[PDB]
Structures are given as C-alpha cells and as structure tokens.
Design a protein around this ligand. Structure first.
Ligand SMILES: Nc1nc2c(ncn2[C@@H]2O[C@H](COP(=O)(O)OP(=O)(O)OP(O)(O)=S)[C@@H](O)[C@H]2O)c(=O)[nH]1
Ligand SMILES: [Mg+2]
Length: 190
C-alpha cells in the first residue's frame, strides 16, 4: 500500500489477472464509463493494433474518503496472453489486491487453470502468497449458451472459497460488485 499522513491520502493497487480474452480490460472500460468524471482519472490502455492488452491497462479512482483520508484505488489489468508473461509479472510490483477474471467458456477452462497457476507462480516469485493476498475471483461471460456452470467452475478454480462474482463484463453486471468486494478486502485494519 502507500499511506500519506502529511497529505492525508491512501493509495492501493489492484490487479486484474486472467487468461487471454477473459475480460479484464472490459471490466476496466465499463468501470471507467460509468464513473463520474470528477472521481476518476484517465483510462490508460497500453494495447496493440488488435485491441489486446500489450503491457497493462491503468485506471485511477479518487474514490470517496475513509476516516478522513483521501483514498485512491489504482486499477491495473495485465496482458494476460501467454507470450507476454515477461511483462505480466511486472504488474504485480506493489500489488495489494487481486481480481481473477475467469472466462466461463468451456473451451477456456484449461487456460483459466493455467492462468491462475501462472498467477500463483508470479506472486510467489514477487514474494507474495496467493492465499495470503486479498483476492477475489470473477466468472466472466455468464451470458453464453454453454457457459460452464458456476458450481463446476468453482470446483476447478475456487477450492478455498474466496468471494466469487458472476459477471457479464460488457454489460457491467457483476463488475462494480467485484470491485467493491476487492476494495473492502484490501482495506486492511490488521
Ligand atoms: N460473451 C462474452 N464476451 C465477453 C464478455 N466480456 C468480454 N467479452 C469479449 O471478449 C473479448 C476479450 O475482451 P478483453 O477485454 O480484451 O479481455 P482481456 O482480458 O482484456 O484480454 P487480454 O488483455 O488478456 S488480451 C472482447 O471482445 C469482449 O467483447 C462477456 O462477459 N461475455
Ligand atoms: Mg485486454
């Protein structure tokens, strides 16, 4: 994290982790679209010609005030696709909370597994334990006809019972509720 007693502001880093085309940038775009122009910064998206995230998406939220503190939440999304691992692992610099965006398509349940595993590897290499970090999981793409059932998707991705939220990113369903969950967890009085 980062406290600023003299400035009276709190800064936290949240990272959306997930395989390719699983909806991280979509989460952030929807968030930016429905946030008052007063409490949000510009949405930066280091993307390629194809619209896939090339380094990261970054979105600040000058959100409300804690016990008088300013509170600023820094949303990040990684490149996700496999061959950008080099860059992906960099986004977890001073990560304070994680959101795992799982693609609920059946074809990409394997890639979901691989991406969660890459997540654990990269956090450990960064000096973080996935079970120790505040982290939430999202089951994106709940609008598809053959989207894997929520239960059978938890069995494969959520053995430890961390908060799960079903979402349809483009529409925004589940998006802000996911962000709220991650934020409430990140706010550590411990
Ligand atoms: N069917 C369905 N498609 C979705 C949903 N959310 C996002 N998509 C689509 O999937 C594609 C991937 O979205 P995108 O936002 O680029 O994912 P990403 O995680 O940022 O992809 P990357 O950065 O790892 S490469 C987009 O074309 C988007 O429209 C959803 O909830 N349901
Ligand atoms: Mg993206």
């Amino acid at each position: 994290s980062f406290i600023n007693y003299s400035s009276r502001e709190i800064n936290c880093k949240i990272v959306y982790y997930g395989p390719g085309l699983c909806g991280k940038t979509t989460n952030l775009q929807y968030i930016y679209n429905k946030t008052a122009a007063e409490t949000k910064g510009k949405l930066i998206s280091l993307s390629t010609e194809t619209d896939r995230t090339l380094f990261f998406d970054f979105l600040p939220l000058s959100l409300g005030e804690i016990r008088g503190f300013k509170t600023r939440f820094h949303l990040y999304t990684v490149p996700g696709q496999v061959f950008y691992d080099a860059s992906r692992k960099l986004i977890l610099k001073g990560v304070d909370g994680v959101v795992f965006v799982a693609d609920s398509q059946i074809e990409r349940m394997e890639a979901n597994m691989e991406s969660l595993e890459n997540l654990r590897i990269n956090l450990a290499e960064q000096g973080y334990d996935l079970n120790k970090i505040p982290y939430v999981i999202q089951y994106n793409k709940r609008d598809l006809p053959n989207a894997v059932t929520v239960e059978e998707m938890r069995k494969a991705l959520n053995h430890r019972n961390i908060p799960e939220y079903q979402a349809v990113a483009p529409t925004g369903v589940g998006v802000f509720d996911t962000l709220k969950a991650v934020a409430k967890l990140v706010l550590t009085e411990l």
